[PDB]
Amino acid sequence: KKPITIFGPDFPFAFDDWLEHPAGLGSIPAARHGEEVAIVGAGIAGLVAAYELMKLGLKPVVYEASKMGGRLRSQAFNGTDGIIAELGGMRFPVSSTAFYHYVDKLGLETKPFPNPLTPASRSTVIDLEGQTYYAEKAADLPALFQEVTDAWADALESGARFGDIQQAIRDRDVPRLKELWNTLVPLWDDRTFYDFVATSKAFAKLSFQHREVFGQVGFGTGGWDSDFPNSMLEIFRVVMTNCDDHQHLVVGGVEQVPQGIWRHVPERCAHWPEGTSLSSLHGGAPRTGVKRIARASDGRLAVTDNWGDCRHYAAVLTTCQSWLLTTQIDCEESLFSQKMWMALDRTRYMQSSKTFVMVDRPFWKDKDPETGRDLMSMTLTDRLTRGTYLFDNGDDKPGVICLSYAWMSDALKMLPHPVEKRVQLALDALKKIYPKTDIAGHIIGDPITISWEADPHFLGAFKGALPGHYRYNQRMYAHFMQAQMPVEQRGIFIAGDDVSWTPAWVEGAVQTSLNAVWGIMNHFGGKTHADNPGPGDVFDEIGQIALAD
Amino acid sequence: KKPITIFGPDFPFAFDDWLEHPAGLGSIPAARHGEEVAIVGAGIAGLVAAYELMKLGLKPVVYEASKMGGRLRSQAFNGTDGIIAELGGMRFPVSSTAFYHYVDKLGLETKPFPNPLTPASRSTVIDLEGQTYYAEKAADLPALFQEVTDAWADALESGARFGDIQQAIRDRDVPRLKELWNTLVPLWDDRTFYDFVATSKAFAKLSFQHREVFGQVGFGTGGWDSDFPNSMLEIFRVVMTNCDDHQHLVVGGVEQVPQGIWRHVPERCAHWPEGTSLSSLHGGAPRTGVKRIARASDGRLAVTDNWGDCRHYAAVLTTCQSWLLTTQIDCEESLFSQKMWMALDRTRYMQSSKTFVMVDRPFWKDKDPETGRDLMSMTLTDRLTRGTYLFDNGDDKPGVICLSYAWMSDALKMLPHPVEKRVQLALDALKKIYPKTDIAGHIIGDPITISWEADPHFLGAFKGALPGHYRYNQRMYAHFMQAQMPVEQRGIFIAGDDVSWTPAWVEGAVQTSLNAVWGIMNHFGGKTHADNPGPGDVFDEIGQIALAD
Numbered sequence A, B: 001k002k003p004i005t006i007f008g009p010d011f012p013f014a015f016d017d018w019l020e021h022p023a024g025l026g027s028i029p030a031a032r033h034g035e036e037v038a039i040v041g042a043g044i045a046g047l048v049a050a051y052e053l054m055k056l057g058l059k060p061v062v063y064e065a066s067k068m069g070g071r072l073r074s075q076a077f078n079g080t081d082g083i084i085a086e087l088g089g090m091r092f093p094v095s096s097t098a099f100y101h102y103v104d105k106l107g108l109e110t111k112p113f114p115n116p117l118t119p120a121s122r123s124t125v126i127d128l129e130g131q132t133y134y135a136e137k138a139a140d141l142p143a144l145f146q147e148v149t150d151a152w153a154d155a156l157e158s159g160a161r162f163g164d165i166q167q168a169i170r171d172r173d174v175p176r177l178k179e180l181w182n183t184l185v186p187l188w189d190d191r192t193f194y195d196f197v198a199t200s201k202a203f204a205k206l207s208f209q210h211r212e213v214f215g216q217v218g219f220g221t222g223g224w225d226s227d228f229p230n231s232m233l234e235i236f237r238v239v240m241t242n243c244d245d246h247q248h249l250v251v252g253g254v255e256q257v258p259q260g261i262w263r264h265v266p267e268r269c270a271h272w273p274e275g276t277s278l279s280s281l282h283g284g285a286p287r288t289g290v291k292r293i294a295r296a297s298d299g300r301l302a303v304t305d306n307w308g309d310c311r312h313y314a315a316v317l318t319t320c321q322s323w324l325l326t327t328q329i330d331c332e333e334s335l336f337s338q339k340m341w342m343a344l345d346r347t348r349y350m351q352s353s354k355t356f357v358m359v360d361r362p363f364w365k366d367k368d369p370e371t372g373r374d375l376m377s378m379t380l381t382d383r384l385t386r387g388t389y390l391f392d393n394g395d396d397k398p399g400v401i402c403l404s405y406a407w408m409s410d411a412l413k414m415l416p417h418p419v420e421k422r423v424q425l426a427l428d429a430l431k432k433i434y435p436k437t438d439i440a441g442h443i444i445g446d447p448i449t450i451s452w453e454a455d456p457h458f459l460g461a462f463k464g465a466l467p468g469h470y471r472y473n474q475r476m477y478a479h480f481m482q483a484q485m486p487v488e489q490r491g492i493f494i495a496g497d498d499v500s501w502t503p504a505w506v507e508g509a510v511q512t513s514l515n516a517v518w519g520i521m522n523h524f525g526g527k528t529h530a531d532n533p534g535p536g537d538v539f540d541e542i543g544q545i546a547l548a549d
């Protein structure tokens, strides 16, 4: 059967085909070869754009204020080789075909992520209101859990034509997909996920506790409560494109994706000599953080770095999170329309924390000879840790444990606390769940934590779309299409997962980046090859519907 | 006409009458006079309770981990007398009768708060998408604003029987209020404010922009967007009890409320000698922060402070924000039912930042002879400052300007930034609005800022009730009623504005405190006088409806 992929629904362009086609993404007039384009941010969106623009014969100049990779960050533990904690993105749905294009291009290895109740996880434990349930398959759970699942399946089929939309995605039937999706847009933009859940037939006829347990742990594979306030359109996108199943981790860390793109030598670039990579073009490193972007008096865009160094470019791509164009960069107001500012400024970010330790061995696989149970499981709880994940690196390697992965309120619980207290709070919660398991005794190396909200170069883990934000996201996603733009707004571009329709998913950063590549190519008077048309060649036909004032 | 007051709707008890009645709040058996009751937190809820319990003949022992007054905090500027910035609560609706009972008791002076389009504000400026509107009265504003107001009035009357509910409040017609209110509870618990707005007839027939403007500035008297995700029941409570109009500030700072309660000598206490105040009972200061609460082997509650000192009490009231009973205090898990923990733990906190400067004089009242406009106005914008308030202390005193009062996303935009950058960001935004006004030149003293989310003794400005949180709030509000509780859960109490139905409003802290006074009196075998019945005497009859599982 044809795989589900992140194929629209908003802009069902085949990015994977565009990338794989042997003609390449297009071309730029030879007279513009070697011209510079500024790229703000060295995360996945900045680097994907830089890489493909280099291939088209431009000289991207990437600036990075903090760390290479942005929210793809894999921190090594003390003294180890190949043992990392994924601080940002960690579980990549195989529906992410644009992303996986680069993963494959680098020859990186992936393996199934130990999500609860999957073959990669031996066991799961749910702990709610002081009651603990062990499962090695879904059927092992109390009846309430299958009831929640059935009600969710049914609410999605009844309220979104889930099956029909997924079939259309499988077959890449664009006219059908748009018809279905475009029906849903004005009906669900303005409504929350919780409203979708509460007012569904399947859940309205169940107890409040079914809804509540759905929030805390779902049907035993993951909680939803942090996303309850979001526009249901966001959740539809996630489930319809299977963002929420068949996920892999990148072995050795996903940070190897941005780092590898930086160093990767394409077989063929336009203009550049053999052996050219982004790295070599920069002499090893991106430029420092950007402090200012303004229209210069020669018409170009002036980008000023932290040290006052000012350079001029025909085009500038920004990939930082949207608030940073006010908060961290002095970005001249007339460079975006007031409608674009409102979209960039009203956009909301979700908070997230993760706290990891390393352990001497995957001791959780040991059996409690009294009960038959693993000493420790993938843990979902209403306690402060919320989600605990177990990473097995082989019987003879240390294990890693994400003691707590938390979002929104539960992340904000940890905000002001240092790592020692984070870990202690988590161990004390996990001691309530597993009173007989000595986790502490196995812990080695250093403890690693993060709060994405705290960091001024991110002001959050990822966007979450509120009700009524469809029009904002539509403005942002379409910004790379500039033919109708006032001339004073042209030449600056945006990309990244906040521009995307699917914010907490790396595929959205990749796809928007590729749209910007097309926009920038076009800006330099370039164009796609006639046999491999690109995003902006079809955008007016199959792009996101616009809503009324 | 009889005033609107914060009279239910959930528990329409006449706290004001209770407080004012000459008999007093009740009594406790003489044998228990002088016994201690621990109070965690010296904000308004802890201090009200402590004050009323002292009057009944107990010895409250108040602990405070940080600053007296909690979220009633008035910081004096360098070198000045009587010139303060309100860092927490600042505008107290006159419908807050229990609160104003204590304000009057202390003889404190109040004056109308300079909200937009009131007599206390001379002018207001709205700045949206780069367009600026000046108004000295509502009619000065473009027609869109009156439309938004009409639609909101209409959505409230149509969807909530606002007029009826308000009449029932004016008349303190308890059966009618409850009938009207109880109808709304199951219908709106699970739905957001934005949903109520979008799906109203009045707004559904207006452009998206009408909704949007309503979020950003309302109808020209205040924005609603940070409250859009909350349960609509919360909002109903606000508007029905006039929390959102006729607001006063306390002259010299509202922190004079908690500080004067601490020092106030009642005419008559049971047991204590004349001249007794909370201060004199404590020898001048509350005890330090609490680190632990547990059941002791004598059957009392053990409270352990930061320095390891452990003291035992027949009753403990905690008034810190609910998360802190896991995050900051080791509070023995069996002291609360699991249902209670879940309420305490799931409760969500809103973020808030304010940044104030002092100016040499109220220069904003000067006229621009070219335009006839004030040099500066009460400012509502979509720019990052959001709301700017102007505080006139008289022509011959310095003025105070709250450069930016922001909530949620717009507060999170400032989170990691220091005060200098906060003030500069705000002055730059205000320069875009008022390009001809030199604010900087009038600024003297020190700048003052806060972010309530950042402080570990608060983990936010105040609760905001999410959809589906009615049951949690019902559990917490009712926790002072302990006759059916397991014995192990009795004797600990909670109060404060997160226990209340009206979280960002001081009256809710006062009303819950008073309930807990009742509970604690009852716990010590005391009771109200027959001619002045108290909260728990009528709670089972007029209390908040419970919802089904």
Ligand SMILES: Cc1cc2nc3c(=O)[nH]c(=O)nc-3n(C[C@H](O)[C@H](O)[C@H](O)COP(=O)(O)OP(=O)(O)OC[C@H]3O[C@@H](n4cnc5c(N)ncnc54)[C@H](O)[C@@H]3O)c2cc1C
Binding pocket: A040, A041, A042, A043, A044, A045, A046, A063, A064, A065, A066, A067, A068, A069, A070, A071, A072, A087, A088, A089, A090, A091, A092, A093, A288, A289, A290, A291, A319, A320, A321, A324, A328, A329, A352, A353, A452, A457, A458, A460, A461, A462, A495, A496, A497, A498, A503, A504, A505, A506, A507, A508, A509
């Ligand atoms: C906690 C968490 C878990 C996640 N889990 C998943 C997952 O399981 N699966 C999945 O697919 N996706 C996941 N994601 C999302 C994925 O990681 C992102 O969508 C993607 O990494 C974002 O890429 P980006 O290039 O848009 O932005 P970023 O990586 O944010 O890149 C922007 C870069 O801009 C830089 N920058 C900022 N300001 C400046 C300045 N003034 N000058 C120069 N540079 C600047 C930043 O430092 C950063 O490096 C997760 C994200 C988080 C936060």
Ligand SMILES: Cc1cc2nc3c(=O)[nH]c(=O)nc-3n(C[C@H](O)[C@H](O)[C@H](O)COP(=O)(O)OP(=O)(O)OC[C@H]3O[C@@H](n4cnc5c(N)ncnc54)[C@H](O)[C@@H]3O)c2cc1C
Binding pocket: B040, B041, B042, B043, B044, B045, B046, B063, B064, B065, B066, B067, B068, B069, B070, B071, B072, B087, B088, B089, B090, B091, B092, B093, B288, B289, B290, B291, B319, B320, B321, B324, B328, B329, B352, B452, B457, B458, B460, B461, B462, B495, B496, B497, B498, B503, B504, B505, B506, B507, B509
């Ligand atoms: C930014 C903001 C604006 C507001 N504006 C308004 C307004 O305009 N009008 C209005 O009516 N209301 C307003 N409020 C609400 C009002 O300020 C609150 O409702 C009220 O002050 C809350 O009082 P409380 O006693 O419940 O809690 P708190 O004031 O939080 O007091 C609890 C105390 O417990 C202490 N504590 C915490 N942990 C411990 C520990 N482990 N041991 C000992 N002590 C501890 C804290 O330090 C704190 O002093 C506002 C609040 C804020 C934050």
Ligand SMILES: NCCC[C@H](N)C(=O)O
Binding pocket: A129, A130, A382, A383, A384, A385, A429, B325, B326, B333, B338, B341, B342, B345
């Ligand atoms: N199970 C009830 C206690 C949960 C605890 N307050 C926590 O957040 O972990």
Ligand SMILES: NCCC[C@H](N)C(=O)O
Binding pocket: A091, A226, A227, A407, A504, A505
């Ligand atoms: N809404 C939960 C966050 C989604 C995130 N991409 C994750 O998979 O963890």
Ligand SMILES: NCCC[C@H](N)C(=O)O
Binding pocket: A325, A326, A333, A338, A341, A342, A345, B128, B129, B130, B382, B383, B384, B385, B429
């Ligand atoms: N409306 C003009 C732009 C606003 C600017 N990004 C700000 O946050 O203030």
Ligand SMILES: NCCC[C@H](N)C(=O)O
Binding pocket: B091, B226, B227, B407, B504, B505
């Ligand atoms: N979040 C809106 C209410 C906040 C507060 N009571 C105020 O008037 O500022």
